[PDB]
Design a protein around this nucleic acid. Sequence first.
DNA 1: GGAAGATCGAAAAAAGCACACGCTGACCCGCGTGGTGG
DNA 2: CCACCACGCGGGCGGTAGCGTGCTTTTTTCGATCTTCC
RNA 3: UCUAUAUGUCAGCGUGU
Lengths: 49, 48, 50, 101
Amino acid sequence: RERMGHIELASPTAHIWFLKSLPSRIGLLLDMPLRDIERVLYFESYVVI
Amino acid sequence: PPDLRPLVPLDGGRFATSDLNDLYRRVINRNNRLKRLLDLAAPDIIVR
Amino acid sequence: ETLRVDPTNDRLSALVEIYRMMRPGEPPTREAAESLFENLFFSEDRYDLS
Amino acid sequence: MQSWYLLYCKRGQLQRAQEHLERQAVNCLAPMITLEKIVRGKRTAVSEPLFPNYLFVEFDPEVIHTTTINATRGVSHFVRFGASPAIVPSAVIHQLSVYKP
DNA sequence: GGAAGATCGAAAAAAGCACACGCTGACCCGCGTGGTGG
DNA sequence: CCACCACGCGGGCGGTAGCGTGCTTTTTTCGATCTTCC
RNA sequence: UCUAUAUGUCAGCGUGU
């Protein structure tokens, strides 16, 4: 009832609570509109690092 | 932990699969297939 | 006023706009848009009034 | 002109989807790899489609609409990013054709 | 004379919709794919 | 050597498209304009 | 209290409000 497990994801995945719950935490931190955030997160447009 | 998402018997030999169990199974399957695709040297579009 | 507001000025443009409104994310094709408009209200199987 | 598109196919009906797509006269492609294993006591070189549940199609959207392909029996759904369906460049198909793992 | 901010109505998205108790049914993957052992 | 019995992973379903359709309040954003300036 | 008898939502309701 207490021991938990863990799954090693081969690729990083953003937490949906910090991304979709308005105001978006990632968008607020990066000061970018949510539209491009969901575009890059769901593989729609490249972003420069 | 499994006890928080148990598989209660249904008196007919079947098990009532919880929603969390199904979601975890789907996530595990997707992770396994993504690992297989990555290990297969697949192109960019498919892995994306 | 409605005639002034809308940007469409031909039957083909109106059909393309209707198809885009009905099925977003699909390539606008003239024959596909015509078929969709015909089936929306002028098809016996798709549209039926008792 | 004809373009290349990627489709997710349902598990098990990839073959019937391929026959249905060939029935509509469009170009199809899926990587092929043969592997040797023991079945029923005999060794056989059985073919297996690489990247399972994935199909590439060369077809012209004007002559045949995308929704018609999306509604074809045995095909799960078009692979798409955003509203518009994804476009596979010809170089990817070039590599895939010469891909011999 | 173009830009910036700004603002204002309009469009889109999220959350909530009282409590307690008693009863009935319907499960709680389907299906192409092995696979087996007659 | 072949017909009944497992079976094991994607899953929107089913199809060669379309399915929906009687609330209110709050919050966020967006297009169109505006309006005020340097 | 592990000593028995150790599934849940949905839909239809009904009762007290």
